[PDB]
């Protein structure tokens, strides 16, 4: 009869991983074996992993049932072709190049779009400027709401249009190799992108002829948002509004490594013959994955918990200097006010969390902050609560905690260094 904050699993548990619980003893001898930093413990010593969401989530059977089937065929595939007819019915676009990473996508079209547009329209590559709503050298065109977390705004990830006409006459048009819109936007924890603004992005980009590249990890959850507060959209489905949202792209580059829901993948996709790595089950798996991730029960609750997590935080007296949809960052300064600079609060703060609950977070973000991931389709309730009361642990023998002198940071070849 009541309303339900953080949502029930729409789906059954199948197959689980199983983590040991440990004593502070343990973990107290473990953090200090790791010199003081989380990064390097072992995945069996940590009982909650928010180091990252990337290619961490879980999968669903349909997905699992796809490795089974592959086509290893180095070329004509069917395995391919029904990738490609998962791009083909969702987005729209009949061209498919999977990629190993997310990062493999961007290799590829911005040293071709570059290449591009000094062919035809004589770009200059020493005035080169891209541009975005948030991130060679690139420029985010931003609205002013975005980074105010004092006031709630529908979509604080959109294009400034001012900003972004203003910006291509600056350095002009012949200059701009490319606009990547980032959906959803990477600033401030993540924040959505309106179909209308998108829209009007991409009238500007064929004024002056560029090339408008839609990079989407997150492209479900921002098609949730605009069924969600988009007055216009509220009765589509998540499919529809994705398919009208990339009508007004020329090309997608994408991880899928998150909203696809699986541990590894990539695509760079165009709806034109213009501007001109992966195993046979991995694309069969991933031709569902887009499906399965786009599910409305599933949206709703992944993004339930996160909220969960975030309003969480806040009632217990955490701030969060930004927190979005992928991820919050907790203030470790005003969290251990009693802790200067020169100590790493953050890092200080990423231990003692580990001590306590066993939790795993990293210390990347003037300001110390601690950054908050959730793994899809991986924690429960449970857990965020157990989360919360760690911090809740924290902030009240926060006086007792002690800082850093010593950050230990290893050459990049111990890290790997396989065990004695």
């Not at 072709?81 to 998962?86: I, T």
């Not at 703060?349 to 210390?363: D, P, Q």
Request: aromatic fraction near 10%; charged fraction near 25%; proline fraction near 4%.
């Amino acid at each position: 009869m009541e309303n339900f904050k953080h949502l029930p699993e729409p789906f059954r548990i199948r197959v689980i991983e199983p983590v040991k619980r440990t004593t502070r003893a343990y973990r107290e001898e473990a953090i200090i074996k790791s010199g003081m930093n989380p990064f390097l413990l072992d995945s069996e010593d940590v009982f909650i992993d928010l180091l990252t969401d990337s290619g961490t989530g879980a999968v669903t059977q349909s997905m699992q049932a796809a490795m089974m089937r592959g086509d290893e065929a180095y070329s004509g595939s069917r395995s391919y072709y029904a990738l490609a007819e998962s791009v083909k019915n969702i987005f729209g676009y009949q061209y498919t190049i999977p990629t190993h990473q997310g990062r493999g996508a961007e290799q590829i079209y911005i040293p071709v779009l570059i290449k591009k547009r000094e062919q035809e329209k004589g770009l200059d590559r020493s005035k080169m400027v891209a541009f975005s709503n948030y991130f060679c050298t690139v420029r985010n065109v931003y609205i002013k709401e975005a980074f105010d977390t004092g006031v709630r705004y529908d979509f604080k990830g959109n294009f400034d249009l001012e900003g972004l006409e203003r910006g291509i006459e600056e350095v002009g048009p012949n200059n701009v190799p490319y606009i990547v819109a980032t959906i959803t936007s990477n600033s401030a924890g993540g924040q959505p992108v309106s179909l209308a603004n998108l829209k009007a992005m991409y009238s500007i980009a064929k004024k002056y002829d560029i090339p408008v590249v839609m990079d989407s990890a997150r492209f479900a959850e921002n098609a949730y948002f605009i069924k969600q507060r988009e007055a216009e959209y509220k009765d589509w489905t998540i499919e529809q509004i994705t398919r009208e949202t990339y009508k007004y792209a020329d090309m997608l580059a994408m991880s899928a490594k998150k909203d696809a829901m699986v541990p590894m993948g990539g695509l760079l996709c165009m709806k034109d013959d213009s501007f001109f790595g992966l195993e046979g089950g991995a694309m069969e798996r991933l031709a569902v994955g887009l499906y399965d991730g786009m599910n409305l029960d599933w949206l709703a609750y992944r993004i339930a918990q996160v909220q969960y997590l975030v309003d969480g935080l806040e009632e217990i007296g955490v701030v969060c200097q930004q927190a979005g949809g992928h991820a919050a960052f907790v203030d470790a300064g005003k969290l251990l006010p009693h802790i200067p600079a020169d100590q790493f609060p953050a890092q200080a703060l990423a231990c003692e969390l580990y001590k306590v609950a066993g939790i795993r977070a990293v210390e990347i973000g003037p300001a110390e902050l601690l950054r908050l991931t959730i793994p899809r389709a991986t924690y429960t309730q449970t857990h965020m609560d157990f989360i919360i009361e760690a911090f809740k642990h924290v902030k009240e023998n926060a006086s007792n905690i002690k800082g850093l002198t010593f950050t230990y940071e290893p050459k990049v070849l111990r890290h790997f260094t396989a065990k004695l």
